[PDB]
Amino acid sequence: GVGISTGTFNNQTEFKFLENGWVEITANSSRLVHLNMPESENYKRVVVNNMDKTAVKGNMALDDIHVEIVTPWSLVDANAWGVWFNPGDWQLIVNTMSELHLVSFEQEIFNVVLKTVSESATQPPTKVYNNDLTASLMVALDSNNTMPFTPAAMRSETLGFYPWKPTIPTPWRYYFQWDRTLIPSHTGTSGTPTNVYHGTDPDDVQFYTIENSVPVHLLRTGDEFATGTFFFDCKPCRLTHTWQTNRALGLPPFLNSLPQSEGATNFGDIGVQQDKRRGVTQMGNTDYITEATIMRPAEVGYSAPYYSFEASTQGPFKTPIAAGRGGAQTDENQAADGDPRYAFGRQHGQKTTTTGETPERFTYIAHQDTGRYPEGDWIQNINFNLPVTNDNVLLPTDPIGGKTGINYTNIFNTYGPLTALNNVPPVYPNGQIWDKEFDTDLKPRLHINAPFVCQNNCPGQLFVKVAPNLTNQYDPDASANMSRIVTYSDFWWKGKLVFKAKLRASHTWNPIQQMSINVDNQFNYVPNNIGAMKIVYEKSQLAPRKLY
């Protein structure tokens, strides 16, 4: 069955409006995937050790040592917003929907092709491509999620974002266990710290093979493969942001004195002595009821140690932070509430005609005011007693450990039973969409990498690979490296991701932040005279929501 197609290209996003303001978004994405023969046919256990870098005192954070199993299989990952929606669709969703529901996912492989390269070793010399009709492409869909979960978006290795531009999958590899020690130090530290990779703990070894745990399918041109329809189990993702802070929760103080003339100088006045006011407070000493002192239900947001690194059996790792805005606009603390920074290129944004190999990037800065501005933090001695005396105040300025560039905010952590928090907002187009939950007894309240964490079950991973096209000479009983015909494959991938949205309703007199084409962004949405493209990142939760 060579002369018949086995599939259809479809990259349309359908918006189906239902009853009561609910829409059913059907994002169709098709892509032509190009796939090469594995450079090797065996699994390799490789160690990566860049001690040359960590050898330099004060370079701990640049540690890359790990051990990974290198498989002869490739992963077809489509878990990233850019694969399903273009700037247009996205603007539609973000400007009018109030919440998003991830419903189901299904993919299929069709119109498979396998060619053989022949070196017409004459003159230049030449190269001749031919069809190997009876050759097969191997396909394995790990439904049971036996294999380790490895999101390609984490390393900008998902399918590309352009319907009219071929793409490729990524060689699949996964972490193996290993013990590693690396002691912190600074430029002036003495002696040689302790930078040792101890190896692997036998009680943590887990060598996985696809061949042994997932049925594999062989497809020839005539064949096709389709996944079933997987249904997610995730909480809805909101498309609105909160702006309220503790300072803006509840009943404002009653102004006894109101401005009588226009002018951004004419303020209103509470009109009551800060120690002669009524209200509630959690400060049993003073009688000062102040906007920064009065009681509030709980606490929106929280403080966590910044540029903290922790260490365990495998080595050091940065301490993650779940947090939004908190601070002026061109007045951040990227570190404090962890604004994510995305590095990618060409195939996932970055102008296409770009040269060199320096990735493009951006630091996403959410609209939700749930972050913190450390410099504003301070601490006072129980006696209160203002103006506070230097001996009774710890400030983001006073040093810690005699260190000049470290202070309590750095060590600080105000997470507790009163912490109100929100989930990570979606990041177009470089963000991951869904993520598999940790199989720990107690799970995390959220994941920092994706807004959708399928709990009870997630779509399995799809592995692809060109099956061994051997030559007439092959001897198992001789390490050699099995000479095999240079074969490559081309197939089309088609996926269908279904969402369920809820149309928003206005509730204020005033208009609202809406995504829109300007005379400034204009050319970020259209190709140029050479056909170069790029996909600029966009914000998602533009639109306020009352928090309390």
Task: In whole angstroms, give the CA distance from residue 323 to residue 301.
Answer: 7
Please, what sign has the CA dihedral across residues 237, 238, 244, 250?
negative
End-to-end CA separation in angstroms for the chain? 64
Residue 332 interacts with Ca ion (CB under 5 A)?
yes
Task: In whole angstroms, give the CA distance from residue 525 to residue 522.
Answer: 6
Binding-site annotation: residue ranges for Mg(2+): 144
- Helices marked H in 417-513 — which ranges? none
Residue 485 interacts with a second copy (CB under 8 A)?
yes
* Residues whose CB falls within 8 Å of the CB of residue 317, separated by 6 or more in sequence, listed in order: 309, 310, 311
Interface with a second copy in residues 497-516 (CB under 8 A): 503, 505-516
Only one of the segments 261-269, 314-322, 382-390, 420-428 lies at the binding site for a second copy (rule: CB under 8 A); that segment is 261-269
Only one of the segments 98-106, 230-238, 369-377, 471-479 lies at the binding site for a second copy (rule: CB under 8 A); that segment is 471-479
Residue 478 interacts with a second copy (CB under 8 A)?
yes
Of 198 and 403, which CB lies nearer to a second copy in the complex structure?
198
Minimum Å gap between C-beta 300 and Ca ion is 13
For 52, 161, 197, 198, 476, the CA distances from 313, given in Å and listed in that order, are 21, 38, 10, 10, 40
**How far is C-alpha 1 from the chain's CA centre?**
42
Using Cβ positions, the residue closest to Ca ion within the complex turns out to be 332
Which of 34, 247, 341, 403: binder of a second copy (CB under 8 A)? 34
Residue 74 interacts with a second copy (CB under 8 A)?
no
Residue 542 interacts with a second copy (CB under 8 A)?
yes
Of 2 and 386, which CB lies nearer to a second copy in the complex structure?
2
SS3 93: helix
Interaction pattern, residues 140-169, with a second copy; x per rule: CB under 8 A:
-----xxxxxxx--------x--xxxxxx-
Is-cis flag, bond preceding 429, omega within 30? yes
Task: In whole angstroms, give the CA distance from residue 286 to residue 386.
Answer: 10
Task: In whole angstroms, give the CA distance from residue 233 to residue 288.
Answer: 49
Q: What phi-psi label fits residue 456: left (phi over 0), alpha (psi between -120 and 50 degrees) or beta?
A: alpha
Strand partners of residue 31: 493
Residue 343 interacts with a second copy (CB under 8 A)?
no
Which of 117, 196, 406, 411: binder of a second copy (CB under 8 A)? 117
Minimum Å gap between C-beta 383 and Ca ion is 34
332 binds, among Ca ion, a second copy, none (CB under 5 to 8 A by kind): Ca ion
Residue 68 interacts with Ca ion (CB under 5 A)?
no
148 binds, among a second copy, Ca ion, none (CB under 5 to 8 A by kind): a second copy
Which chain residues interact with Ca ion by CB under 5 A? 332, 369, 371
